[PDB]
Amino acid sequence: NSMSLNDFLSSVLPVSEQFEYLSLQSIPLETHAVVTPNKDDKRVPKSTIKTQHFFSLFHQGKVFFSLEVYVYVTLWDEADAERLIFVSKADTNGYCNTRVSVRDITKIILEFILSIDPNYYLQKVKPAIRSYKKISPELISAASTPARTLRILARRLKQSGSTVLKEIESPRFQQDLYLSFTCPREILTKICLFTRPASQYLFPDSSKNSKKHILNGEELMKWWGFILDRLLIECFQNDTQAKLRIPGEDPARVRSYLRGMKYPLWQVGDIFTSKENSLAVYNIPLFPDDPKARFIHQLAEEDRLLKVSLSSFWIELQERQEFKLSVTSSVMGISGYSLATPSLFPSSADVIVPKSRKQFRAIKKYITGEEYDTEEGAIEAFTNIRDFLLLRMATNLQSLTGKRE
């Protein structure tokens, strides 16, 4: 069994070759629902927890691969719980010296995420809005002004000769300042991928590297199509939803592309269609930097939310400017249960969790703020990520050797 992120990655990397990797994760946060709630609805989620997973792979002091993924867990007071994996971006810069399967790397990281028990994200959760009522003394919080903060520091010093509260992370306070939840380890899992071609996603100006291989929309869809198909076969139960939509394309072609997939249940469509056949706003998930959300926002800015329906929605969306055909854009969805039960809890070996969003963003930025017009950028990213971690976190990137023959 593969029980560590290292176990998963190595299995797919060339044997005897050294690779290092970054595995960054955000503190789970209480947040608004993935799909907008319908007041006239039987039920509503008690809570939604959002976490971002960021991965970068480095080979020989250079970074050549990255993957950005979000994981939502939705809790229903009575209606079970689902977890939704949103795949946001993946990219390469073409600066890898050795030969590897980016596809299997991407597939294997996703399996690892699948392996994680949902509860792991629910142990300690950052509240969307904290209440300090259960607590006096006065706390220095996000809301505090600098002057108030300065004054508080001074009083504390005078009282105790320290500016800190010892009991701040003490268990009673934790019970008060954080949320925790539990749920069946075996839950409904959904993955949503939207593919839109572009020259660069996570590696600015890498398009300018000749070594880099850029895919047109069709190639890209096929690429994500292939990965998903394996995920379905390898990690999912047999009667599981697999839906693919390519906007503006005739369904015989799409249906015909699907026929070719190894999993036999792929269908043309989306995993958001409902029995109740509600409005578009009530079935469409709002993801970060996502084609579906930008357009739901427009419908909001025009008081059309009530006006649109699901069938209408897809059609209306294809019309919009970001969608200039012919370019191929596809939306992919998976709904179902995992073969194996999700039991994994990640370790420091598995991931690095920064203390704040600020620190999380700072590290990521070293990778995504770089310029990859030339190799110097790939090296620089590796250099900063390493120096920054050691320096501010006393941490090292994970190191491993490829096992695959």
Binding site: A143, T149, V281, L286, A300, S356, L391, R392
Partner: protein, 232 residues
């Protein structure tokens, strides 16, 4: 038509009035803030690590330098910004001189005080805003950076050397040589970095320092510094 022209001109003259007013206002602010800055900085000296903490709390500052430089950024114990337009009208209100003092690292970095000056310059136009420029100032690079130090690099136009050069040029030490007069051959965006210090870092150091004192670490930056509203 003629009346319209008259108005249009008067309009163009009004926009020109506004600019003068803005400059006047800026000068007014600089004169008032001066004595508060002296008072404030004197208190800041009593605090240790104030600058180290501030430069770790500012978000975009990290964008301009190498992560390794933070070993040295952390030795800064004093920062002073004097705006030149207070000594003479010849200077733009954006002009300033900045002085940093570094305490040093044993066996690696020398304790020193460095002063850099930034001024606006123009090139042939009445209707051009102007750009920041500066003069190189000597700074003693840390020993750890011998390999990327422009003054110790032997094969400079060498292919490998040219890469060791460019690496040194993207450190905070490279920035001290920034001038703004040789585009593409100097520390990148040295003008923007200069602006951060005068516009944000020096002016708001205390807000930044207070940002680092939140009791719950996850709240740092939450201060500042995607769902709908369906029915009415």
């Amino acid at each position: 038509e003629n009346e319209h022209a008259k108005a249009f001109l008067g309009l163009a003259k009004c926009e020109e009035e506004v600019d003068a007013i803005e400059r006047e206002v800026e000068l007014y602010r600089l004169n008032k803030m001066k004595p508060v800055y002296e008072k404030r900085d004197a208190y800041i000296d009593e605090i240790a690590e104030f600058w180290k903490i501030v430069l770790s709390q500012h978000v975009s500052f990290a964008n301009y330098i190498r992560a390794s430089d933070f070993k040295y950024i952390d030795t800064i114990d004093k920062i002073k910004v004097e705006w030149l337009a207070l000594e003479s009208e010849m200077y733009d209100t954006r002009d300033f001189s900045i002085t940093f003092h570094f305490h040093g690292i044993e066996g690696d970095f020398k304790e020193q005080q460095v002063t850099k000056v930034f001024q606006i310059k123009k090139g042939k136009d009445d209707q051009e805003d102007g750009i920041l420029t500066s003069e190189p100032v000597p700074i003693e690079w840390p020993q750890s950076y011998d390999s990327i130090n422009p003054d110790l690099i032997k094969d400079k136009r060498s292919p490998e050397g040219k890469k060791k050069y460019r690496q040194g040029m993207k450190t905070i030490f490279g920035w001290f040589r920034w001038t703004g007069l040789k585009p593409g051959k100097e520390f990148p965006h040295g003008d923007s970095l200069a602006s951060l210090f005068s516009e944000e870092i020096y002016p708001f150091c205390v807000k930044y320092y207070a940002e680092a004192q939140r009791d719950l670490e996850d709240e740092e930056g939450e201060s500042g510094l995607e769902v709908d509203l369906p029915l009415s």
